[PDB]
Each structure stands twice: as structure tokens, then as C-alpha cells.
Amino acid sequence: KLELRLKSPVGAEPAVYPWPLPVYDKHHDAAHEIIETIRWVCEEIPDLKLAMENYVLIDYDTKSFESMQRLCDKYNRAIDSIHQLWKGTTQPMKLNTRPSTGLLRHILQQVYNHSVTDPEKLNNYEPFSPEVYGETSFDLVAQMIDEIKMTDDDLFVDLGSGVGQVVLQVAAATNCKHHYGVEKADIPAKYAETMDREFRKWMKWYGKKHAEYTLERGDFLSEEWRERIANTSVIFVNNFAFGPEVDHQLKERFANMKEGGRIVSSKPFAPLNFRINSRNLSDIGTIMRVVELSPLKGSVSWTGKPVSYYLHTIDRTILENYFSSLKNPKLREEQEAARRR
Length: 341
Ligand SMILES: Nc1ncnc2c1c(I)cn2[C@@H]1O[C@H](CO)[C@@H](O)[C@H]1O
Ligand code: NA
What we know:
Blueprint: E1 3-6, E2 15-18, E3 23-25, E4 28-29, H1 30-44, H2 46-51, H3 65-87, H4 101-115, H5 137-148, E5 155-159, H6 165-173, E6 178-183, H7 186-206, E7 212-217, H8 223-230, E8 234-237, H9 244-254, E9 262-265, E10 288-292, E11 310-314, H10 317-327, H11 329-339
Parallel strand pairs: 5-6, 5-8, 6-7, 8-9
Antiparallel strand pairs: 1-2, 3-4, 9-11, 10-11
Helix pairs in contact: 1-4, 4-6, 4-7, 5-6
This protein binds the ligand Nc1ncnc2c1c(I)cn2[C@@H]1O[C@H](CO)[C@@H](O)[C@H]1O and sodium ion.
């Protein structure tokens, strides 16, 4: 049995790769995962980055066991010496910190590589499919995270969480305390169990912390989920492809959320320029502000168009102000004159 091993920078069990190296899918294989892992550990540890001949990493023969073993042996020797350095006065790498954005992208790729065996069985009806998460949705999610600035008072739910990528990313990147994903379909929920196991393993391998999270199987339209959605502070829902009946039902669930509750989605649930009046009083735009977030630069979905998400914030002052105006005869005449102009 031939194999390649990479030591963990924090003394977790080593990553073991059999030879011949696995192919994970059409653009990802274990040889390049090994090279990228070494690169990302170098970003975590300056002394390792100094010791490695950094531009040579690309010049190894990924088809030669002897070449690849040479690279891994060089990394492993460097890790041993860094662990010795840390037994001295030098301070060890800080533990229990969150991964940088670049490291997190890599970790999520590596989780996906090890977890998802038949990518064809996935229902690629969203703007981007899970196969390209790192180049596309990952950056949309990262931008969203920086915009919404969640705190430890928040509770995050991904409705229709697929193989779990959004939940893993957000749980690794935010001070939010609790993170849930719920997914109805058997195949992605099955893959999500492996993703969960591998993410926890790799995060410990790199010495990085994530917040608490749970990936479940379920129907987000069930009665149990009504109460749960009502008590969620941030919802993510990739509703781009959902039919009118599903979006209608979701709207009814969001109408129970608390003030300041937020929903990020791939298709808006209300017009961006809602103007409340007598005929539209029961519509969801009466209780939320809706804005389009900055799009992802440099990619297009299979529609051929740029992609962006939509942020909805529960805000009942829209409705409060409308009723206060109705009360005042002057303002009521002016509202009727503006609707008719
Ligand atoms: N009612 C539901 N309860 C839980 N998950 C749901 C649904 C429905 I409709 C769709 N999905 C999942 O949503 C994902 C697409 O965003 C896809 O992964 C799709 O399977
Ligand atoms: Na170097």
C-alpha cells in the first residue's frame, strides 16, 4: 500500500491519501488538493511559508509518486521543526480562531471533494450549482456576511440547505451563535451528513473554530418549521427556482418574524419600490424593506446574467406610518391625490 501523508499544523491526525491519488470530480483531484493544503498551511504559519520554495510547488510531477512524496516529506519535516520551535519561547499559532476567507474557501472545497460522490444526482436549478460553490456562491455569501454583520444575538437558518455549504460557511465566519440548515430531498440531505463530518474533521485539522450548527432533514413548510421561522433572526433561502405557491407559503411564514428580522434570497419576495395603499394592505411589502445586494463581479449563471441576492428587513414602521396618515384627514387627502397622480 502506497500513500501520501500530511501532518496537521496543530497535531490532529495526519491527512492520508492513497496512491493512485483520487479524482474527485472533473476539475478537482487529490494532487492539487495536497498542493493547495500546503499553500494554505503556509498562509497560517509564516515560518513554514519561508521554509518552502514557494514557486516550485507547481513544478512537482503530480503523476509521480516519488515527486509527490518529496513535496509531502518536505512539508512534514518543516511542520516537525515548527512544532519544535513552538516548544521554545516562540508563541504557538493562536488556536480557536476563525479561518480567513481564503482558507475557508479551500476547506469547503476539500469538504466537498471528500463528500459528494455523484454530482449529477443534484438538482442544479439555483443560479449556481454546488460543484462551483467556491468560485461563485461562496463570494456572494461572503459579501452578504460582511453586509449583515451578525452578532451573538442572532439565529441563522438556511431554508433548503442542499448539501450544506452555506451553513458551513456562515458558521465558520460569524459571531452568530446558532446555525441551522433544513433540506427536504433525500440525496442532498444524505450528502449533507458527510459534509458535516468532514467539515468538523478538517476544521480541527487546521486548528480553526466554527460556531455551533445543525444540518437536518425536513420540510420547511411543516408546522414545526412555522414556529422556528418565526423565531429566526436571519434567513437565507435560495428561492430562484421556486413556484408561486411555495413563495406564497414562505411569505406567510416570514410575516410572523420579529422586527429587524432579515431574509436574504436569490429572488425578492416583494417589489423593491413598494408604495403602500388601500388595495395592497395585506401584501408582505407592507412589513419589509427590500434592497438588492451588490452582484458577483466576473461570473454569470447559466442564464447568462450576473447574479445578486436580495436583503429583506422586517420593518413595521411602513405600516405604522400609513395608518397614522389615514388618521389625519389632510394627509389622507394627500395620499389619495398621490395614488391618483
Ligand atoms: N419544502 C422544502 N423543505 C425543505 N427543503 C426544500 C423544500 C423545497 I419546495 C425545496 N427544498 C430544497 O431547496 C433547495 C433549493 O433552494 C433544494 O435543495 C430543495 O430540495
Ligand atoms: Na519561501
